[PDB]
C-alpha cells in the first residue's frame, strides 16, 4: 500500500454526456497512461491509487472503440495492469474474456498493414510473454474456443508477421498450451499439417529468403516444448485414425494413414525426438491384420533409414527396427516386396548395418514368390558396384545370385544373367584384391565359367542372350589391343573343363558360320544381275541359297525373323552393306577395323514387312557367332611374352589358347612365326 514509487497520471479517461473527451485528447491521455505504467516496478509500487483506472479500462466504450490507436493504447495499459496486480488476478473471468478477445484483435492487426500503431502492438505481444500474464487465458470457461482463435490468427496465411517476432509467437503459443491437458483437435491439425504443406528445398532459387511464420512456429513448439507437445501429438495420431476409420467413407482410412506416415517422416528429418510419441502405433501396424496398413508401415520405416538425421533410428527404437527386418517373413508378398524395394537407397545412404542385412537378404534371394527375387538382384543393378562389395559380404548372397541363372522362371533368369555379368566387369575395372577380400573373389571369378555352362542347356533364347551379354560386358570390343587380352586371360583363369570345351566349341563354330555368311553374300549377289533366272543354276542355286539361309536361322529363337531379315537384304541388294558384312566374317581382320566395320553397320540399319529394329538385333547376335573377335590380331599379343618367368597361371593359358588356335585353323596360325622369323 505504501511504496517508494507512485502513479502520477490523474486525467479522466471515460467520455460522458456531462464531460466529453475528444478522440485526440483521449489518444494522448492513454498514450501517457500507457507510457507511465510501463516504467513502474511490480513490487515497490503503490498499487492502491490505481483501481481508478483498473475499472476504467474495461468500459466497452474503450474496448470496442473505433479508433485503432485507442484500442491499442487501451491494450498496452491493460497488459501492465495484470502484470502489476498479479498474482492477485484483479479482474473477473468474464471481463478477462472480453479483455482477451481484444488482445486477439491486436494480434490480428499485427500481421496486417501498419495502422500506425504496430509499435504499440509489438509492445503488447512481447510483454504479455515476458510477465507471462498471457497464461491467464487458460483458466477461462471459453479457453478452448479462445485457444483455437489464438492459433488460427498466427497460422493464418493472409497475415504477414515480421521475422523478428517468430521467437516471441512460438513462446506465446508455447506457454498457453502447456496449460492444457487436452487440446482441441482443430488446433493440432493446424500445427502439424504445416510440416506436410511447407517443404523447404522444394523450389531451387536465388536465396530462399522466403521463410514462413507457421512453419518456424511449429518447429519451436515441437523442439522447445517437446515435453508437453509429445503428449498431445499422440492424441492427434489416434484421433485422426479414429476419425477416418469410423468415417462412412470406408476408403478414407488408407489415405489418411498414408498422410500420417508422411507427417512422421518430415518430423524425423527435423525433430526426431518426437517420433517416440507414436513409434508405438507403427510397431502395432507392422503386426496389423490388414496387409495394406502393414505395407504402408513397412514403406515408412524404409524411408526413415535413408534420411539425414542428427539422431540414429536403429539405436533409439531398436524395438521396431528388428520388427522391420522381421517383415522379410511376412505372409503377404506385397509386404515382402515393399521391404526389398527400399534396400538400394538404404545401402547408398548408410553403412550402419551390414549384419541384419547380410542375415536377411540371404532369405530374400530364396523366397517362394519370384517377385521379391527380382527385387533382390535389382540391387546389383541399381546400387553401384563399389558399395556392394563393401556392404554385402555374406557368401550366401553371391552364390544364390549365380544360382538363379539356371532357374526355370524366365523374367528372373534374364535379369539375373544381365546383372551378374554387368557386375563382373565392373568388379574388375574397379575393385582391387587384398589378403581378405580374395575370400569371395573365388565366386566372382567363376562367373564367366558359369555363363558358358548355360550353352549346354541348349535353349535358343538363352544362347541368344548369353551371346548378346558376353560381348557387351565381359569381353568388350574396346578400348585397345592389349587390355582385351589382359582381361581375356583373367576371364579364362578360373575355368572348368566344360567351360573350355564349350569355349573352344563356340570358336570352332565361328569358322563354320564364317564359311556360311561368306557363301551367303556370294549366293545373295546372284540377284545383282541376271545370271540365271533359269539358266546355269537357276533351278538349283536358288534352292542352295534358300536352303543355306535356314542353316544360320536354325540357331535363332525367332527363326521366323531370321530367314525374314536376309531376303529383304537381297531386296535392298545394297553393296555398301554387303562389304561391311563380308568384312566382319572373312577372318583375320585387324581387331580395330572390325570394330569400325561393325559399328557403322549397326547404326546404318536404324531408321530407314516389319521393323528393321528386328534386323539390327538379329544380325547383331548372329555376327557375335560369325566374326573373329578372340581369334585375331590378339595372337600377336599372346605371342609377345608379357613375362619371362612366373605367372604359371598365365602361360598355361597362353598355351591352352595358342595350343588350340593352331588346331582349329592354322591358315592364320603358322604365318605370324614366319614374319617373326
Amino acid at each position: 500500500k505504501g511504496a517508494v514509487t507512485k502513479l502520477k497520471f490523474n486525467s479522466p479517461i471515460i467520455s460522458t454526456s456531462d464531460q466529453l473527451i475528444s478522440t485526440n485528447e483521449l489518444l494522448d491521455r492513454l498514450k501517457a497512461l500507457h507510457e507511465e505504467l510501463a516504467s513502474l516496478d511490480q513490487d515497490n509500487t503503490d498499487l492502491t491509487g490505481l483501481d481508478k483506472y483498473r475499472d476504467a479500462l474495461v468500459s466497452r466504450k474503450l474496448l470496442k472503440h473505433k479508433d485503432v490507436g485507442i484500442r491499442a493504447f487501451t491494450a498496452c495499459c491493460l497488459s501492465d495492469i495484470l502484470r502489476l496486480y498479479a498474482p492477485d488476478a484483479p479482474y473477473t473471468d468474464a471481463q478477462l474474456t472480453d479483455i482477451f478477445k481484444l488482445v486477439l484483435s491486436q494480434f490480428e492487426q499485427l500481421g496486417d498493414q501498419e495502422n500506425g500503431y504496430h509499435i504499440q502492438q509489438t509492445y503488447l505481444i512481447t510483454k504479455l510473454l515476458e510477465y507471462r500474464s498471457i497464461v491467464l487465458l487458460a483458466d477461462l470457461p471459453s479457453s478452448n474456443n479462445l485457444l483455437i482463435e489464438l492459433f488460427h490468427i498466427f497460422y493464418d496465411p493472409n497475415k504477414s508477421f515480421p521475422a523478428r517476432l517468430f521467437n516471441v509467437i512460438g513462446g506465446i503459443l508455447g506457454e498457453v498450451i502447456s496449460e492444457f491437458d487436452s487440446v482441441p483437435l482443430e488446433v493440432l491439425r493446424l500445427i502439424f499439417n504445416k510440416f506436410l504443406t511447407y517443404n523447404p528445398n522444394e523450389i531451387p532459387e536465388g536465396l530462399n529468403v522466403t521463410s514462413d511464420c507457421g512453419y518456424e512456429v511449429s518447429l519451436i513448439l515441437c523442439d522447445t516444448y517437446s515435453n508437453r507437445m509429445s503428449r498431445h501429438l499422440t492424441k492427434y495420431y489416434s484421433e485422426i485414425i479414429h476419425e477416418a476409420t469410423n468415417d462412412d467413407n470406408n476408403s478414407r482410412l488408407l489415405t489418411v494413414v498414408v498422410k500420417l506416415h508422411k507427417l512422421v517422416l518430415r518430423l524425423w528429418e527435423t525433430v526426431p525426438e518426437l517420433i517416440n510419441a507414436v513409434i508405438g502405433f507403427i510397431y502395432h501396424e507392422l503386426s496389423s491384420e490388414n496387409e495394406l496398413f502393414r505395407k504402408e508401415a513397412t514403406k515408412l520405416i524404409g524411408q526413415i533409414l535413408t534420411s539425414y538425421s542428427d539422431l540414429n533410428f536403429v539405436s533409439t527404437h531398436s524395438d521396431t527396427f528388428k520388427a522391420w527386418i522381421s517383415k522379410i517373413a511376412d505372409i503377404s508378398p506385397d509386404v515382402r516386396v515393399e521391404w526389398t524395394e527400399s534396400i538400394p537407397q538404404i545401402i547408398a545412404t548408410r553403412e550402419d548395418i551390414s549384419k541384419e542385412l547380410n542375415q536377411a537378404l540371404a532369405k530374400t534371394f530364396i523366397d517362394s514368390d519370384p517377385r521379391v527375387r527380382r527385387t533382390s538382384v535389382m540391387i546389383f543393378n541399381k546400387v553401384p558396384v563399389t558399395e556392394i562389395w563393401k556392404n554385402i559380404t555374406n557368401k550366401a548372397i553371391y552364390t544364390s545370385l549365380l544360382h538363379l541363372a539356371r532357374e526355370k522362371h524366365k523374367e528372373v533368369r534374364e535379369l539375373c544373367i544381365n546383372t551378374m555379368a554387368k557386375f563382373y566387369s565392373n568388379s574388375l575395372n574397379e575393385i582391387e584384391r587384398t589378403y581378405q577380400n580374395k575370400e569371395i573373389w573365388e565366386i566372382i571369378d567363376t562367373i564367366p565359367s558359369t555363363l558358358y555352362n548355360l550353352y549346354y542347356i541348349n535353349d535358343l533364347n538363352i544362347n541368344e542372350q548369353v551371346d548378346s551379354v558376353i560381348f557387351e560386358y565381359l569381353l568388350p570390343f574396346e578400348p585397345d589391343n592389349d587390355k582385351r587380352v589382359h582381361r581375356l586371360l583373367t576371364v579364362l583363369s578360373h575355368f572348368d573343363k566344360k567351360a573350355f570345351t564349350s569355349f573352344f566349341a563356340f570358336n570352332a563354330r565361328q569358322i563354320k558360320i564364317s564359311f556360311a555368311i561368306s557363301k551367303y553374300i556370294d549366293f545373295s549377289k546372284f540377284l545383282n544381275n541376271q545370271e540365271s533366272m533359269s539358266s546355269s543354276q537357276g533351278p538349283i542355286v536358288m534352292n542352295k541359297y534358300n536352303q543355306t539361309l535356314q542353316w544360320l536361322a536354325s540357331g535363332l529363337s525367332d527363326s521366323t525373323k531370321a530367314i525374314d531379315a536376309l531376303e529383304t537384304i537381297k531386296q535392298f541388294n545394297d553393296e555398301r552393306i554387303f562389304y561391311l558384312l563380308n568384312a566382319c566374317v572373312t577372318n583375320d581382320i585387324p581387331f580395330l577395323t572390325f570394330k569400325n566395320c561393325y559399328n557403322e553397320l549397326v547404326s546404318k540399319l536404324q531408321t530407314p514387312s516389319i521393323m528393321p529394329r528386328d534386323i539390327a538385333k538379329v544380325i547383331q547376335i548372329l555376327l557375335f557367332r560369325a566374326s573373329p573377335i578372340i581369334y585375331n590380331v590378339s595372337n600377336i599379343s599372346v605371342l609377345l611374352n608379357l613375362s619371362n618367368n612366373s605367372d604359371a597361371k598365365q602361360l598355361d593359358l597362353k598355351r591352352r589358347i595358342l595350343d588350340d588356335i593352331s588346331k582349329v585353323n592354322p591358315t592364320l596360325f603358322k604365318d605370324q612365326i614366319r614374319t617373326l622369323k
Binding site: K408, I457, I513, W551
Partner: peptide
Amino acid sequence: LMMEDAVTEREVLVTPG
C-alpha cells in the same frame, strides 16, 4: 525347379550341314 544341361561336351553349339 532348376534346368539341366541337356547336351554333351562333344555336341555343344553344333550345326549340321
